[PDB]
Each structure stands twice: as structure tokens, then as C-alpha cells.
Design a protein around this nucleic acid. Structure first.
Ligand SMILES: [Zn+2]
Ligand SMILES: [Zn+2]
Ligand SMILES: [Zn+2]
Lengths: 231, 167, 107, 59, 600, 187, 100, 57, 47
RNA sequence: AUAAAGACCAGGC
DNA sequence: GGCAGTACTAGTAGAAAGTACTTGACTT
DNA sequence: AAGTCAAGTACTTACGCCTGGTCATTACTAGTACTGCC
């Protein structure tokens, strides 16, 4: 029942919400292929401008509204660039949340712009720039998920289709469909293999970690007995 | 093929007898059945054809047991069976055997003795078939691209022994 | 249109005030009157329904079963596209004691 | 006949019956008899003419 | 489905209910009592399970509707029971409430303040209000006098009334109450706590005495336990200030219990605000009259139905209605009555469920009566609700066929004669469809059936060419009258290269496993065709693989199958971004040679 | 218990006068640009002079052809809701109908049309049908049959009856072909 | 004659309350492929009932492609009723929506 | 009675004899090819009960 | 486990609006997801 | 002019 | 002609796991 | 005496689809009508 609505948000049948936006960007996998091919689209800029036709996508669209907010967010991001979100303010949300995705030009995601301006910073090339980034952002604004697409069915079939390919025993810990089904179906509880990953300290060394493993490693009373003579 | 059918009459005075009676009945179904109530040996019987006609006395009518199957069949033999008893008993069980000309068409799972199961896509004419230097045209061509996957080398070495044996 | 409108598509008759499908039926009309259909669950026997003077009905409300019994009431019904196996659910589940009532639109 | 194509699904008399006199009935019949002939409707119009003549004159 | 018959209504919501006494007293048509299938000579017997008034049966006209088998949808029946008993589905719920109430005060063994607290809390939980459900729990301001308790119920009533007043006042909750998943979470949790109730408690708090507990004898006969020494003394101080008992006395208890605590169960057994203001009692779940399905669901083909169980219920019913008649003109006559109660309740429980009957030697499986018949392999619904037997479909073996442009297929003439599709005659089909009706079903392309304006369906199976031309010259004509002038004939058309066909293959496992393709006839064989780059998406081969072939029956269905479920639009699978398409072996092994340098 | 079940049962259901009615009908595609004429030629023309169950009487025309709009807005370009399965459009609309509803007990005029031995067939205002059975014949009235060629009735005074014949409604027949109004004799 | 009058005013008031005005709609202005598959499906099924045509038809017989030409020239009297999960709805005219 | 034993295949035994399964004892010899002739004469079967068990040993 | 679910469904007097697709296939109108969310209206030039 | 279900074995993908 | 054996008919009688729900012992 | 924690256990559960074949119309048993010998 879960699917994208006209408010650009995936929710169940009755109306209760699941996530406010599909993967944060609401873009389909069937169209996010050339989104990171900056050198390819730059080499074929004329044909893309011919088929996207940006000259007819200005009437029912706002341009500078999202560009200002994106400029401010990009300003503060590189202004701090020091500490993660546990001490970062939330006064600037993503430029796509408070704005309409398919109506406001320039409202793009974060990593897409981080690699966009980086690609521009690492080259200098006869098409201009203000039109290249306009066709680029327009390409991102014409690759969204269509409002109405059955999303949960695709999520149900795309996670089980490769499961048929790799239903076997092993290829260190349990792996495959015995675990993939266990996490989702068995109402995950105290599990057969309790795993926990610990990042180690920098100043410590091998002789500091082996003392730690020997300290926590349990030892029953049976591990010390060599021989019992009960008379 | 050969498809044998077992017809039992009269679903205790017997009332359904093989053959005809005396009153009015339509014609045009005497090509298969005889006057004795049995079909001719060799006639072409497709779906919806008379195999055996029976005359009932409770209704005084000769109703025809139809034949409904998948493919048309040719009759090859009709057996007659009557239970043995000290008293005379009229036959009430007939065993008929069919035969179906199964012409080999495409889609049949043709294969060899090495495990390469396949089907037929289209039967090409001999003049559009590659011809050898002698002039023969190999009637069968198998895909050479299935060998790196099926790993059936037997159909290569045995193909050497086959031609070396036929020469 | 494939899983329903191919095999199970049947336009049954659903009652409005009761909201069930199996209970409605078509009474035996006269020689001149035809096309009678009503819901006999919400209806009541004519002799049991009696009466601010004495009220009288237009005799179109009156319907009679093949057994001869006279009834009055239970008229509001309409035709609704529905799978026949859902009517089988209404019948089979009613044998358990559970009741399924459906309110059609409007109302 | 007796189908949703020909008969309404749900019908409800909007407001309580407010009486109209013979003058309103005569104006009503004389209005929408000229405003109806602008196949089975002719048999009905021929019956509207009867109630239009009787309430106005003598047959 | 025909688009000539519009449906004038729909179903927005559905609600449940429980059959009670008077509902089925006036629901069915005739009462049937004797346990006979049908007498000799082959005709329905009166008063039997195959009563003629329960719908037509064996080419015999019904006695209730008066029509034949095709137009009679059946009629509901009923059988009469001597004594009322419970249902196997609700017995697990009645055991909790029978082990709950006090046998002397007819209340629960709690006190009134906490039971009313759960009642008024569920009163808030009926609406979509959750912010104040826990604020009401902390209202304890002020052994215990009844004055401050009644005043406590007063301040709680004003608190709940004010809460619902302000919530309904300002945009929060609709008058019909809100329904979501988070409210059903705490309702199914608080009611589950209401079943974690007194079951672990002793003496009643309203009146100061204990009560004899009940012991369930595992499927038929909840029993009553005997009392002990430390409680018979309590029976002697209550005046200072294990045994088969009966069946109907359970109703006698639950009646007064459900009357002295009506306001509590009013909110417990309701997940929505009760707008109708009905009373819930013990007569609802306690079944007094069984219900048999119409004869349309009771066809003989042998006792291939519930007959061999309903006849057993009616046999014990006739034996027990002769018991009270034997005692009218007044010991083993009492023991056989007790065993009659036990064998008639086990009989109806055997009719509803298959886990409560005493049974006998290995039965090669008992007959599935109603519930286990509604679950063949654990939910029979998977046979006639989820997956249907679809119509207008073909199925055969596939064969490779190049020169098809990756979006069409090849259909044999044998499939171009059976399948068909309705098309209403218009001004843009008078030149092409006339060729079809003249052609006929056998020779391609033609028409197999013509659907008249009056609903009657005409075919052209055994009709001559002169009759085909007669219907051709009388095809595009006005209707017979005005009531039918709105539509014309919808001539059926087998298939043409402008139609759409969806291909399917079991087991389908992804979105791209059911694509909508165009068609193209090939008078060459009786097997299906496919392209090379097409069989790679279906995860199919050609070693004898058999796949299905569907066919839409609507113009809008053709649009969705040609523009949404099309194969070219399915070039990319929504899994990882990799295109599941492309030539596999032959046309790529020729690329290394064609596009090479040693090729002039 | 009994009174509560009657509350369950009562909530189970929960001479020319003009009445407004609200109906809900379909609309053909050929009447897309002309919807009012379609509704008239599909649900209004076959309704006049036909007894209706809701209003309880004979329809004598129509008035107030106002098609209800699905979008509450001043332009004549309205819109109709098409069902997702058929091209027809289900739309509400209100219309006033002059209905003729004779009730029981009312006194109405009649025009003699049939004079049989046990029944009188009369045309009230030359449009509707009415009947009077033999049990509704006064004892003082005597029937006389003509031997030349039909018959006539004789009242208590001893003279034939006049064409204009006024009586009182007994019962209105609906399930028949044409609306027939039964007459009484004594009040 | 009194009960459904209040019910009718409730129907009209609630419908008008769910109806969002023209200048307040804030959804996507591009023609969705579902609305496109439904405008081609409904119009082809609409024109199949001998509907008044608003474009030139020359030797064409496929009603599906006829609707494709109708949408190509924007000559269909049809408006999309886009619902919201809360109950509100916008009336987006197909003529205003752009296609690719 | 033994005709029914070889006809349907299942054994209706009073003693409840040693083997665990109750069905799957006779096989309709189609007699289609001499390899199917010899196959039914050199046949070994673990038991129709193991077909329901879902082990891989 | 539709039997145990039928017990807890009718015991609490459940009134479901058949919004889930598994409920929109028992009777249904078209569906909820996909082209079943929105509806189709048609403008008419005359009142 | 008619033809329905469950029970076991073998076989295709 | 009466007794009794024989055959036909209608009625009746040992094997996979995973989880929450119920219930008896325990300790404050 | 009541609340909590631990054990028994009831049953509830488990690939997609399709083509064939048989098979059996229940078997044991006792009341009763009919046939042949004395
Ligand atoms: Zn009703
Ligand atoms: Zn009937
Ligand atoms: Zn008490």
C-alpha cells in the first residue's frame, strides 16, 4: 500500500506516513544513471538541451527562489565544516523540504551539488557555465519519481529477486536468506550470533588490545580442569 | 501414438444393444459405424465423430456415443468382450484402439544422448541450408555457443567417432 | 479489470438499510405486475404490522413469496458490481454466526 | 427497461409539497407543451393534452 | 464485463456484526427439522436440508423465488436448536469472562473505580485522542467511603466530557472519531491488559466473598470446581454480615453480569463511537438457531457437502425434542439427557470446527464443514480471492524468432481464432469491421461473436456466409427504441497487430516479469514467439519452457499496457540501475568480428 | 429488552402539486457538449405520465433544469463526473415536477367510458383510468342490460346516470399497466 | 424531506471544505504518466462510444492512438481530480499541464 | 481385497506393519521405452514420507 | 490465521474502509496505489 | 444434446 | 406341504522449527 | 494472599504454475424373500 503521494511523501493506504520523502530525493533508480556523468553530459550538451527544451520550462517554474536558499546553505556548510550534527544547528534544512520539488528550479539535493561544484572546480571549459548548470539542475528536476508510483511493491520485489540468485550456504557468520529472512520475519530478538563492532583507540597497540580480549573472554570452570579423580 | 478406449454399455434386464433398430433415424453417420454397431477399421475419426452407436429399448432410440479428445485418430482394431457363463450373454464391453499420426513439428524436445535438451525454432528448406563440398546439407544444426556453458564435449568427440565410423 | 471483471464480475443486488446481498430476493408477482425485487430481512409480515387513524399503503409495497405469505417493507436496494465469491463469503461466514453489512453510496 | 441507464439510482423529494392552484397548473401545461416538441414522448404529450383540455374546457 | 451496464453504486466502508435470535427468526423462509436428504423417486423432500424453498435444485423450480436455477441466487435457511450454546470461536473469550464475574453480586471481582477508569479511558480511546488518556490516569485528588468515589466518577465524567468537547470543538477529532494504527496499538494493548485482569486475583472487592472458579475441560464442557475448607468457612461468615452443572445457566449468569456492567463492555467491545446506542448482551454470541447456506452452495456432486453433519445435528435434535416430550407425561432418562446436551453441543462444534469433535477411528481426514473448508491450505482465500482463474488467455511453448523489433511477438492462427475482444461499432470502423463480420471466426481476420444492443449474445460458429453478409449489411443501424439508442452493437474481434498482449511466466519475481507487448500474427505453427533480448528479462530459456499469455479486455487496459507496462519503458529495472536487455550470444559473437579491423 | 429492540428496528430504516426532487443519473458521450438534452431524453421523457414510487403519483412535466455542479465556485461551463469504468457521467441535479397524486378519501370527478354489468370504467379528466367493483354498487341501484346491442345503470331515483360522475377514491393501483383508481360508494 | 436536506448541506459544505481554491494549489504542474495513461485510456474509451471529436481524423481506426493525437493537440474536455490523503483535492486541467 | 491393494496402492492393514508410510507402493508402468522398462525393474525408493521432510542429508 | 483474526475483528466491531489493496481486491473500486488514487472529471460547456 | 469435487503415483519448468 | 440352506438387499460402523498464551510453583 | 517469573503446550506454520494417469463409488453384517429336499 505504501506509495508516493502528491505531497511528495511515501505513506500507507489509510493515510499514515512512512517517510517524508523517497530516499530524501524522490528520484527513481530508472533515471539516476547519467545524473553523475558530468563529463558525458558536458560532451553531449547540445542534444540534451534539444530534448529537455529548457526554453519552454520557465512559465510555470520559479528559478531564483531556490537558488538563494541553496546559496545560503552552501555558504554555512563550508563556513563550519568542522563538527558533525551533534553540535550543528538546524536553522537551514535541505533546500528541497520547504520548497516544491517539481516547481522550483535549483532546489537540488546535497551530495549532487557537492560533486557538481567540485567537478566545476576541477576544470575550465565552447559552452558557458550558467547554462550548463541550468540544464544540469533542470535534469535533476526532471528525474523525480512520478507521484503515484507503486513504491512498496518495487521495494518488495527488488529485495527478493536477487535472493533467488544467491540462495546457498556460504560464500565467519551466518549469511544469505537464512539471515535475510531472520532480520525481517523472525521478530528479531536475542540472535544466534551477537555481533558488535568496536573502533579501537589510536594510542593503543596490539599489546593493548590482546589484554582487552583476554579480559572479557569468558572462561568457565571447565577450561581449567585437566583431570578429575573422584574416589 | 496409440490411445485405447474402453466403452461399457448399459450404464437387471439389458436394454442398450449395439446397432440399430426399426424406426426412423437420421442418416449421414454410416461412414464410420457398421450395421452391427461397430466402427470400420481405418476410418478417420476427429473430435466429434461417431465411435459406437447403441439402441435402447426404454426409449426406442439409437443414440451415438461421441468422441471428444485433443487430436484426430485413426482406428486400428476393435476388440469384443463377453463374460463367460453357462447361459448366453450378449456382449456389453468393447475395447477399441486408436492411432495418431504424430508428424514431428517444431517445439518438440529433440536431444541427443549427452544431455543437451533443446527445441525446434523453425524448419529451414534445404536450398537455404548450408551445403558441404560434397553437396550434402546437414539436416540438423545445433548452437555452438551452448558448449562453453553446457560443457558437453561428448557431442564433439563422439561426432568424430560417428563420422569416422560411417566412412 | 482482469482479476474481477473477467470471471467474478456479477451485478448482484445490495440492500441499503440492512446492507446485505444474500437476503434480498425477487417475489412472485401477478400476471400483470412484473419486475419485483426487495429485501426480505428488514421486511415484516403484513398481519403483524398494523396500526392517528388506520394507515393504508399503496399496495405496491406489498409483496408475496411463493409459499403464499404476505410481507411489507424492505424495499431500498440497488444493483452493485461485486465478485460472486464475496457473496459466497457472506453466505459461508453467516453460517459461523458473523454478519457482514455493506453501506452503498450514496449514504 | 428497469436499468440504471433509464432509471435514476437515488431519488429524493427535495422540499415538502407546496400546493399549486389550477392557474399554475394551466400555465405549467401550456408552457412545457410548446417547449417539448421543439419517439415515445409523443404518446406522453398526447396525454398531457387531455389534462390540459379538461381543466380548461369540456371534451 | 460489458461497459454497456454501468454500476450505480460502490462500497466505501464495511462493518461487521453478529447474528442474534430475532434476526434469523425473520431472515430465513422455512424451518427444516428432519435429517433426511431426499426421499425415493428423486425429488426434494419437505423440511429437509435440500428443501425446495432454499433455491432451485435438480431442474426443479424454487418455492421461495419461483425461478429456475440460473436466475435464483438461493435463499438463506435455518435450523432450530433446543438449548442455546456458545461458538467455538468465542469460547476462548467467554472462558475469561466466566472466570471473572462474581456469582453473587453479578459484578466483576474488582472495585468500581478502576473498572470505570478503564471504561472511561477506552471512552477516550474510541476517538483519535491520545494526549489526555494518560492525564486522566493521574486524577486521584482528594476503607473508602462511597461519597468521594461517586464524586470521583463525577469529576472523571466532567473531565472526559470536557476533553471530547474541546477535541471535537477545534479541528482535532471528527464526530465519527478518528482511526489510525497508533490508536489501535494502545487499544489492543489496554484491552489485552483488561484480559491480564482479575484472573490472578481472589476475593471480590465490591462484595466481600470469593466465588467458585471454573476449569476448562479442553474442548466441550467448561466445568465448575469444588470449594475447599478455607472457603466454606467464608460461606459461613458471609451470612454473618469438577462437576457438570448445566448449559443455559451460563447464559443466566452472563445476562445479569452484562447488565450490571453495561457501560464498561459498551466501550470494550466497540472500536468506534457507538452512534446507534445499542446494548451488548449474552444473546449475541450465544447461538440459538443455526444457519445453513442456500442449496446453490450445497450441490450433491454422495454426501459431498455439510449434509452428513447437519443431519447429525438434526438427528440429536429430534432425539432431544422427544426427550422433553417423554418427560411431559411423567434414572437413565436423565443421564441420556446430559449426554444428549454434550453430544449436541459437540455436534454443532464439530460442524463449525474440526478440533473439538470426539471423532472415531482414522477417518482419512474429516470433512471440512465451514471453517476448515474456508482454509484448504491455510487460507483458501488464495484460490478465489488473491489469484483468480482469468479468462481470455492463452498458454503455449515459446520459440525464438528474430526480425521482430523487440516489442512485438508472434501469435499462431489457433490463438487468433479462439481469443477475442469487444469493439463497439462506430463511424471509424465501418470499413474494417465489416470485413471481420463477413470473414467469420475460422478464417483470419474475422469476428466470432456479435453482442446485440439488448444484451443477447450472438455467435457465428455454424452460420453461413449469406447470414454473415446479412448481419454485415444490418450492422451499423440505429437501435430499436430510444431507451437503447445510447449504444450500438459491440462486435467481438479476435486479434490484430494493433492490440496489446501481456506476457507472464511463473514464477514471476520482479516488476519486469510481466511486460505488455504488441502482437503480430504468424501463420506458421501453433507455438508462441519471442525475441532474443526479450527472453533475458523474463529469466527464461528455450529447453521446453512454458509461459502464459494474457489479453486485456478494455480500451483503458490497452492504454496502460501499451504506455505504462510496455517493454521499451521497462528497459531499466528499478533494482540497481542495470538494464536487463541486450543480445546474449549470437549477435555479440558477430560483433567482435564485424566491428574488427580485419574486415574490409 | 423489547423497547430496546424496537429502537434497533426503528434505526434499521434510518390534486396536482409541485415538488422539487434531487436525482442522480448518467449521461451519454454523444451528449457531452449538450448534457441537459441528454438527461431529458434519457430519464425525463420516459418518466412523464408514468407513476413514480418516491413522489407517489403521476408525473405531469418538469421545471427547473438545474444540473448540480461538482466544483462549488459564475460561468455556464460546468463539469460532470465520469465513472472509471464507463464513459457515462453520474451527476446530481434538481428539478421541479407537477405531480398528480390522488389519495384515499379524496373526492374526484369522472367521465363515463365503460358501463358493464358489474364494473364502471371511467376516465378522470380524460387521461387516467378508474374502476368501481360490484361490491361498491349501492343496493338501491339496479343494472339493466340492452338486448339490441353494453348496458346502463339505474340510480335510486329510477333514471339513467349522467356522463359527469363524481365519486371518492378507494385505492390507487400501481403495479398494473396504467394507474387505476378504485372508487367508494358510502362514507 | 428534512433529514436528507441537512445531509445534502453537509455533503456540499464538506465538499466545499475539501475543495482547495485555484490560487492555493501547490502540487507538481507536469503531466504524470499515470494521468497520461488514464487520459489516453479514458478518452479512447470515451471516443469509442461515438463521442464528439475535436480534431481531424483521417483514415485512423485505433481509438488509443486517437486519444494520443487528442492529447498531442490538447482538445479534450477533461480535468484531472488529484486527491490528497487528508481528503482535499485539486482540479488540474489537462490543457494547463505540460507534456514531454 | 488384494486387487484393491494393487489397484489403489495404499495398504489397509490391521496390524499396522513395519514400514512408516501408508501409500506409494505401486507404480503405473507406462511401458513407453525399453529404458523405462528396465528402470522400473531396478528401482530404489527411500520412501514417500521423506518427500515431506525438508532436510538436506 | 483468518479465523483467529475474524474473532478479534467482529468481537471489537471493526469497521474498515477497505483502503489496503488486499482489501481493495475483495470488492474494491479500482485500487489505491498507482492510477487508483486520483479520479477523472470532465468539463462540459453548457450548464 | 453434457461433464463436478477431493485422495495417491509418475512427469515438465 | 413344512423345514432349512443359500444368495440378494438395505442399513450401519513415526518427523522439520518458532512464538506467544495459559498456568503451577515461589517468594515477599 | 497476591504479584512475578519460569515451564508446559497448542497449534499455528512452509516455492510459483502446469500436464498426465488411476479410482472408487464403503465393507461388515444381519434381516428376509426365494429355492429345493424330505
Ligand atoms: Zn434490508
Ligand atoms: Zn429461490
Ligand atoms: Zn462480588
Amino acid at each position: 500500500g505504501v506509495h508516493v503521494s502528491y505531497d511528495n511523501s511515501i505513506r500507507d493506504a489509510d493515510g499514515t506516513l512512512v517517510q517524508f520523502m523517497y530516499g530524501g530525493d524522490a528520484i527513481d533508480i530508472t533515471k539516476e544513471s547519467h545524473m553523475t556523468q558530468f563529463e558525458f553530459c558536458l560532451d553531449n550538451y547540445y542534444a540534451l538541451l534539444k530534448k529537455y527544451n529548457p526554453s519552454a520550462l520557465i512559465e510555470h517554474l520559479d528559478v531564483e527562489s531556490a537558488l538563494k536558499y541553496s546559496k545560503k546553505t552552501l555558504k554555512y556548510r563550508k563556513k563550519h565544516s568542522k563538527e558533525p550534527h551533534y553540535k550543528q544547528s538546524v536553522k537551514y534544512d535541505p533546500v528541497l523540504a520547504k520548497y516544491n520539488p517539481a516547481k522550483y528550479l535549483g532546489s537540488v539535493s546535497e551530495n549532487f551539488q557537492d560533486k557538481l561544484e567540485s567537478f566545476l572546480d576541477k576544470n575550465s571549459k565552447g559552452v558557458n557555465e550558467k547554462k550548463f548548470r541550468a540544464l544540469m539542475q533542470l535534469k535533476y528536476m526532471r528525474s523525480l519519481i512520478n507521484p503515484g508510483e507503486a513504491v512498496g511493491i518495487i521495494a518488495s520485489q527488488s529485495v527478493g529477486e536477487p535472493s533467488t540468485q544467491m540462495t546457498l550456504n556460504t560464500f565467519n557468520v551466518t549469511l544469505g536468506i537464512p539471515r535475510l529472512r531472520e532480520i525481517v520475519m523472525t521478530a528479531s530478538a536475542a540472535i544466534k550470533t551477537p555481533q558488535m563492532t568496536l573502533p579501537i583507540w589510536n594510542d593503543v597497540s596490539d599489546e593493548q588490545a590482546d589484554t582487552f580480549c583476554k579480559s572479557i573472554s569468558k572462561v568457565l570452570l571447565s577450561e581449567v580442569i585437566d583431570k578429575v579423580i573422584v574416589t | 501414438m496409440y490411445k485405447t478406449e474402453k466403452v461399457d454399455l448399459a450404464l437387471d434386464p439389458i436394454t442398450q444393444h449395439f446397432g440399430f433398430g426399426n424406426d426412423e433415424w437420421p442418416k449421414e453417420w454410416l461412414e464410420k459405424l457398421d450395421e452391427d454397431g461397430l466402427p470400420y477399421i481405418g476410418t478417420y475419426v476427429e473430435e466429434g465423430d461417431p465411435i459406437c452407436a447403441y439402441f435402447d429399448d426404454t426409449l426406442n432410440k439409437t443414440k451415438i456415443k461421441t468422441y471428444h479428445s485433443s487430436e484426430p485418430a485413426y482406428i486400428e482394431e476393435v476388440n469384443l468382450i463377453g463374460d463367460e457363463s453357462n447361459k448366453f450373454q450378449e456382449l456389453q464391453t468393447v475395447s477399441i484402439k486408436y492411432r495418431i499420426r504424430r508428424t514431428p513439428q517444431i517445439g518438440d524436445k529433440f536431444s541427443s544422448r549427452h544431455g543437451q535438451k533443446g527445441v525446434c525454432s523453425r524448419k529451414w528448406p534445404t536450398i537455404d541450408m548450408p551445403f558441404s563440398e560434397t553437396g550434402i546439407q546437414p539436416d540438423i544444426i545445433i548452437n555452438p555457443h551452448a558448449f562453453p556453458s553446457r560443457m558437453t564435449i561428448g557431442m564433439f568427440v563422439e561426432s568424430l567417432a560417428g563420422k569416422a565410423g560411417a566412412l | 479489470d482482469r482479476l474481477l471483471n473477467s470471471s467474478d464480475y456479477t451485478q448482484a443486488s445490495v440492500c441499503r438499510e440492512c446492507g446485505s446481498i444474500l437476503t434480498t430476493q425477487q417475489s412472485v408477482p401477478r400476471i400483470g405486475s412484473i419486475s419485483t425485487v426487495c429485501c426480505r430481512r428488514c421486511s415484516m409480515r403484513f398481519e403483524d404490522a398494523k396500526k392517528g387513524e388506520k394507515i393504508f399503503i399503496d399496495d405496491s409495497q406489498i409483496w408475496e413469496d411463493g409459499q403464499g405469505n404476505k410481507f411489507v417493507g424492505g424495499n431500498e436496494t440497488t444493483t452493485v458490481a461485486i465478485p460472486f465469491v464475496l457473496k459466497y463469503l457472506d453466505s459461508e461466514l453467516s453460517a459461523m454466526g458473523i454478519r457482514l453489512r455493506y453501506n452503498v453510496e450514496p449514504k | 427497461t428497469a436499468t440504471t441507464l433509464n432509471t435514476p439510482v437515488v431519488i429524493h423529494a427535495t422540499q415538502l409539497p407546496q400546493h399549486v392552484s389550477t392557474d399554475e397548473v394551466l400555465q405549467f401545461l401550456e408552457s412545457f407543451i410548446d417547449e417539448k416538441e421543439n419517439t415515445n414522448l409523443s404518446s406522453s404529450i398526447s396525454q398531457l393534452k387531455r389534462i390540459q383540455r379538461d381543466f380548461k374546457g369540456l371534451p | 464485463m460489458d461497459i454497456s451496464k454501468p454500476v450505480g453504486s460502490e462500497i466505501t466502508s464495511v462493518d461487521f456484526g453478529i447474528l442474534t435470535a430475532k434476526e434469523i427468526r425473520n431472515l430465513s423462509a422455512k424451518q427444516i427439522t428432519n435429517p433426511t436428504v431426499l426421499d425415493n423417486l428423486g425429488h426434494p423432500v419437505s423440511g429437509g436440508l435440500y428443501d425446495l424453498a432454499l433455491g432451485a435444485f435438480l431442474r426443479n423450480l424454487c418455492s421461495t423465488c419461483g425461478l429456475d436455477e440460473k436466475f435464483c441466487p438461493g435463499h438463506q435457511g435455518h435450523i432450530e436448536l433446543p438449548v442455546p450454546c456458545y461458538n467455538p470461536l468465542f469460547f476462548n473469550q467467554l472462558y475469561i469472562y466466566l472466570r471473572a464475574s462474581c456469582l453473587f453480586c453479578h459484578h466483576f471481582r474488582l472495585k468500581s473505580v478502576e473498572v470505570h477508569r478503564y471504561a472511561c479511558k477506552l471512552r477516550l480511546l474510541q476517538y483519535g485522542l491520545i494526549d489526555e488518556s494518560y492525564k486522566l490516569d493521574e486524577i486521584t485528588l482528594g476503607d473508602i467511603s462511597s461519597t468521594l468515589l461517586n464524586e470521583l466518577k463525577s469529576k472523571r465524567s466532567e473531565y472526559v466530557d470536557m476533553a471530547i468537547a474541546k477535541a471535537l470543538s477545534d479541528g482535532r477529532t471528527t464526530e465519527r472519531g478518528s482511526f489510525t494504527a497508533t490508536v489501535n496499538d494502545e487499544r489492543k494493548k489496554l484491552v489485552h491488559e483488561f484480559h491480564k485482569k482479575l484472573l490472578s486475583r481472589g476475593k471480590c472487592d465490591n462484595c466481600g466473598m470469593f466465588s467458585p472458579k471454573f476449569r476448562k475441560d479442553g474442548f466441550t464442557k467448561i466445568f465448575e470446581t469444588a470449594l475447599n475448607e478455607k472457603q466454606i468457612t467464608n460461606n459461613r461468615v458471609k451470612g454473618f454480615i469438577s462437576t457438570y452443572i448445566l448449559s443455559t445457566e451460563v447464559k443466566n449468569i452472563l445476562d445479569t453480569v452484562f447488565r450490571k456492567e453495561q457501560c464498561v463492555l459498551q466501550y470494550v467491545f466497540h472500536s468506534r463511537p457507538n452512534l446507534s446506542r445499542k446494548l451488548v448482551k449474552a444473546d449475541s454470541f450465544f447461538m440459538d438457531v443455526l444457519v445453513v447456506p442456500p442449496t446453490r452452495f450445497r450441490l450433491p456432486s454422495h454426501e459431498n457437502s455439510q449434509n452428513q453433519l447437519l443431519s447429525k445435528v438434526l438427528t440429536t435434535s429430534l432425539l432431544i425434542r422427544d426427550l422433553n416430550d417423554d418427560l411431559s407425561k411423567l434414572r437413565v432418562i436423565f443421564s441420556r439427557l446430559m449426554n444428549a446436551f454434550v453430544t449436541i453441543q459437540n455436534d454443532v462444534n464439530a460442524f463449525i470446527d474440526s478440533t473439538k469433535a470426539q471423532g472415531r477411528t482414522s477417518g482419512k481426514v474429516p470433512i471440512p464443514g465451514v471453517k476448515q473448508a474456508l482454509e484448504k491450505k491455510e487460507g483458501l482465500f488464495r484460490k478465489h480471492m488473491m489469484g483468480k482463474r482469468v479468462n481470455y488467455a492463452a498458454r503455449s511453448v515459446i520459440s525464438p524468432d528474430p526480425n521482430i523489433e523487440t516489442n512485438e511477438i508472434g501469435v499462431p492462427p489457433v490463438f487468433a481464432v479462439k481469443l477475442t475482444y469487444p469493439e463497439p461499432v462506430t463511424a471509424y470502423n465501418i470499413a474494417e469491421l465489416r470485413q471481420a463480420v463477413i470473414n467469420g471466426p475460422d478464417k483470419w481476420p474475422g469476428a466470432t461473436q456479435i453482442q446485440n444492443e439488448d444484451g443477447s449474445l450472438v455467435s457465428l460458429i455454424g452460420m453461413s456466409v449469406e447470414q454473415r453478409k446479412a448481419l454485415a449489411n444490418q450492422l451499423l443501424t440505429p437501435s430499436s427504441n430510444v431507451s437503447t439508442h445510447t449504444l450500438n452493437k459491440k462486435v467481438y474481434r479476435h486479434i490484430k497487430n494493433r492490440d496489446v498482449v501481456l506476457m507472464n511466466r511463473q514464477p514471476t519475481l520482479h516488476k519486469a516479469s510481466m511486460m505488455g507487448h504488441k502482437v503480430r500474427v504468424l501463420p506458421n505453427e501453433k507455438t508462441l514467439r519471442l525475441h532474443y533480448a526479450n527472453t533475458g528479462a523474463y529469466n527464461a530459456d528455450f529447453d521446453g519452457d512454458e509461459m502464459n499469455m494474457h489479453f486485456p479486455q478494455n480500451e483503458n487496459a490497452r492504454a496502460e499496457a501499451l504506455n505504462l507496462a510496455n517493454t521499451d519503458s521497462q528497459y531499466l529495472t528499478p533494482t540497481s540501475g542495470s538494464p536487463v536487455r541486450g543480445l546474449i550470444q549470437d549477435h555479440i559473437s558477430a560483433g567482435v568480428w564485424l566491428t574488427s579491423k580485419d574486415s574490409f | 429488552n423489547e423497547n430496546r429492540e424496537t429502537a434497533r428496528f426503528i434505526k434499521k430504516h434510518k390534486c396536482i402539486v409541485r415538488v422539487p426532487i434531487a436525482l442522480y443519473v448518467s449521461l451519454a458521450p454523444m451528449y457531452l457538449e449538450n448534457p441537459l438534452q441528454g438527461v431529458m431524453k434519457q430519464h425525463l421523457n420516459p418518466l412523464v405520465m408514468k407513476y413514480n414510487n418516491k413522489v407517489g403519483g403521476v408525473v405531469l412535466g418538469y421545471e427547473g433544469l438545474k444540473i448540480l455542479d461538482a466544483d462549488p465556485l459564475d460561468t455556464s461551463e460546468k463539469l460532470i463526473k465520469i465513472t472509471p469504468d464507463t464513459p457515462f457521467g453520474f451527476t446530481w441535479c434538481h428539478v421541479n415536477l407537477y405531480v398528480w397524486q390522488p389519495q384515499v378519501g379524496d373526492v374526484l370527478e369522472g367521465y363515463i367510458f365503460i358501463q358493464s354489468a358489474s364494473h364502471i370504467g371511467l376516465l378522470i379528466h380524460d387521461a387516467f383510468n378508474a374502476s368501481i367493483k360490484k361490491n361498491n354498487i349501492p343496493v338501491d341501484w339496479t343494472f339493466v342490460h340492452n338486448d339490441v346491442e353494453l348496458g346502463h345503470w339505474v340510480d335510486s331515483n329510477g333514471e339513467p346516470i349522467d356522463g359527469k360522475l363524481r365519486f371518492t377514491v378507494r385505492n390507487v393501483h400501481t403495479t398494473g399497466r396504467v394507474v387505476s383508481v378504485d372508487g367508494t360508494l358510502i362514507s | 424531506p428534512e433529514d436528507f436536506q441537512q445531509h445534502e448541506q453537509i455533503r456540499r459544505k464538506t465538499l466545499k471544505e475539501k475543495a482547495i481554491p485555484k490560487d492555493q494549489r501547490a502540487t507538481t504542474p507536469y503531466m504524470t504518466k499515470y494521468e497520461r495513461a488514464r487520459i489516453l485510456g479514458t478518452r479512447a474509451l470515451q471516443i469509442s462510444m461515438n463521442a464528439p471529436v475535436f480534431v481531424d481524423l483521417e483514415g485512423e481506426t485505433d481509438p488509443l492512438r486517437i486519444a494520443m493525437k487528442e492529447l498531442a493537440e490538447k482538445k479534450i474536455p477533461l480535468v484531472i481530480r488529484r486527491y490528497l490523503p487528508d481528503g482535499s483535492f485539486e482540479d488540474w486541467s489537462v490543457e494547463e499541464l505540460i507534456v514531454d | 481385497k488384494m486387487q484393491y491393494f494393487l489397484s489403489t496402492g495404499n495398504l489397509v492393514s490391521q496390524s499396522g506393519l513395519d514400514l512408516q508410510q501408508v501409500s506409494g507402493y505401486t507404480v503405473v508402468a507406462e511401458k513407453i521405452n525399453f529404458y523405462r522398462f528396465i528402470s522400473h525393474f531396478r528401482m530404489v525408493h527411500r520412501g514417500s514420507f521423506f518427500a515431506q521432510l525438508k532436510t538436506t542429508t | 490465521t483468518t479465523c483467529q483474526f475474524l474473532t478479534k475483528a467482529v468481537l471489537d466491531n471493526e469497521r474498515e474502509q477497505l483502503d489496503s489493496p488486499s482489501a481493495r481486491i475483495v470488492v474494491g473500486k479500482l485500487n489505491n496505489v498507482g492510477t487508483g488514487s486520483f479520479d477523472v472529471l470532465a468539463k462540459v460547456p453548457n450548464a
